């Protein structure tokens, strides 16, 4: 059995940099530490990095439907490491933003930390059902993981559009 040790440390330093380059790009701030050499996007907002993060979760899920248990476990270890880095750095960041900053940065912290927790359980239902039914190798289980994959994408997009309209008539 082979597990990534150096690649896991490289990935946590990137999600650690993302929270320090996070609430600053949604408003008018000066950030010189944007690493555009390893990224593909225009990048002057949290919106373009969230759209690349939603698309990277959906591409690794497609390989899960091929049936590699090593790519599932690698993503499971990357999911637990990102829980510690994003939920905790967003948790101390909401205390300087519970003051005057709370209206232009308060509901974004709910999308970053609280909505990554709801995406993790819909993903858990896809992972546990694929392990025990992998031993049977029939096409019926491939229709069931694919059906839960469509619900993770349909529930997150429809709820985000209704939350944007609620942010505009706040006052």
Curated annotation (Swiss-Prot):
Record has Cytoplasm as a keyword: no
Subunit architecture: Monomer. Component of the replication restart primosome, which is composed of PriA, PriB, PriC, DnaBe and DnaT; DnaG primase associates transiently with this complex. Interacts with the C-terminus of SSB. SSB interaction is required to load the main replicative helicase onto substrate replication forks. Interacts with helicase DnaB alone and in the DnaB-DnaC complex, probably 1:1 binding with DnaB.
Known function: Involved in the restart of stalled replication forks, which reloads the DnaB replicative helicase on sites other than the origin of replication. In vitro can load (E.coli) DnaB replicative helicase from a DnaB-DnaC complex on a single-stranded DNA (ssDNA)-binding protein (SSB)-coated stalled replication fork with no leading- or lagging-strand in the absence of other primosome proteins (PriA, PriB or DnaT). Binds SSB (tested with E.coli protein) and ssDNA. Complements priC in an E.coli priB-priC double deletion.
InterPro entries for the chain: PriB/PriC_sf, Primosomal_replicat_PriB/PriC
Transmembrane segments: none
Keywords (A to Z) from UniProt: DNA replication, DNA-binding, Primosome
Family: Belongs to the PriC family.
Comment field on protein domains: Known ssDNA- and SSB binding sites are adjacent in the 5-helix bundle protein.
Domain of life per record: Bacteria
Keyword Acyltransferase recorded: no
Species lineage: Bacteria, Pseudomonadati, Pseudomonadota, Gammaproteobacteria, Enterobacterales
Protein name: Replication restart protein PriC
């Amino acid at each position: 059995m082979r597990t990534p040790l150096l690649l896991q440390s490289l990935k946590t330093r990137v999600a650690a940099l993302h929270t320090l380059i996070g609430p600053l790009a949604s408003q008018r701030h000066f950030s010189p530490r944007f690493d555009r050499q390893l990224f593909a996007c225009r990048g002057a907002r949290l919106g373009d990095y969230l759209t690349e993060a939603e698309e990277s979760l959906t591409h690794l899920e497609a390989a899960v439907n091929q049936g590699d248990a090593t790519r599932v476990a690698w993503l499971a270890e990357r999911l637990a490491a990102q829980i510690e880095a994003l939920q905790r750095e967003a948790a101390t960041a909401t205390l300087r933003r519970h003051e005057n900053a709370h209206l232009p940065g308060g509901r974004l912290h709910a999308r970053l930390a609280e909505y990554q927790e709801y995406e993790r359980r819909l993903l858990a239902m896809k992972n546990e059902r694929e392990q025990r039914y992998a031993e049977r190798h029939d096409p019926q289980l491939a229709r069931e993981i694919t059906a839960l994959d469509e619900r993770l994408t349909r529930c997150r997009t429809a709820i985000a559009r209704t939350e944007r309209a609620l942010e505009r008539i706040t006052r």
